[PDB]
Amino acid sequence: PQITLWQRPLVTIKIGGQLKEALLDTGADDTVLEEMSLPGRWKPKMIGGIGGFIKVRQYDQILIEICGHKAIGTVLVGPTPVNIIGRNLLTQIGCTLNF
Amino acid sequence: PQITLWQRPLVTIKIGGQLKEALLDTGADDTVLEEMSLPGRWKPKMIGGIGGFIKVRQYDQILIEICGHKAIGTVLVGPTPVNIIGRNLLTQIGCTLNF
Ligand SMILES: CC(C)CN(C[C@@H](O)[C@H](Cc1ccccc1)NC(=O)O[C@H]1CO[C@H]2OCC[C@H]21)S(=O)(=O)c1ccc(N)cc1
């Protein structure tokens, strides 16, 4: 689909058997989700944003279905105030910016 | 232009007579630029992102030229780690997300 930007580009995703809403975010290198239960093993990592940094758990090769499109890749989990789909997954679903 | 997301979607902008590079950021409601000299009056404001909040200066009716497309609107200035073009300006240049 084509998505205009008069509102937040929020999309429904399914991950870890759970349904969530997440922001399609071209400004985010990596995907980061609020605290949630995920199956795998994980590595501690820290990511930097506007107000400083947060500590996250890195999960690799995690399946996500973003608006009915599957992708597998790194998901970070931690105290982000919003679920963010970053460019690492956006590229997999063929998402582009257009003007 | 159509822009893929294997790299950061950085674009050259002109604002306040100065040239900068900024991220086209669908995840950002508002445009926020690193500390810079801008003409005019302003108002204290706080914006929140991944690591917490920062205090910014809000400038209204500011002219920006983003990839050669003019837009006028609100620009926040403050200690963001990167210059961000947010949805308030992206809509003005007809920027959309497609997959
Ligand atoms: C622009 C950078 C700082 C990157 N940020 C992505 C960005 O889209 C965040 C994503 C975001 C979105 C909502 C809340 C927090 C973070 N948006 C954001 O900070 O926007 C602020 C300016 O406008 C306002 O609208 C939303 C928050 C304000 S980030 O969230 O910090 C980020 C950094 C690293 C990764 N891997 C993933 C995300």
From Swiss-Prot, chains A, B:
Residues 20-89 form the Peptidase A2 domain. It comes from the Viruses. The active site is at residue 25. Residues 1-5, 49-55, 88-99 are annotated as: Dimerization of protease. Homodimer, whose active site consists of two apposed aspartic acid residues. This is Protease. It comes from Human immunodeficiency virus type 1 group M subtype B (isolate BRU/LAI). The lineage of its organism: Viruses, Riboviria, Pararnavirae, Artverviricota, Revtraviricetes. The chain holds residues 501 to 599 of 1447 of the full protein.
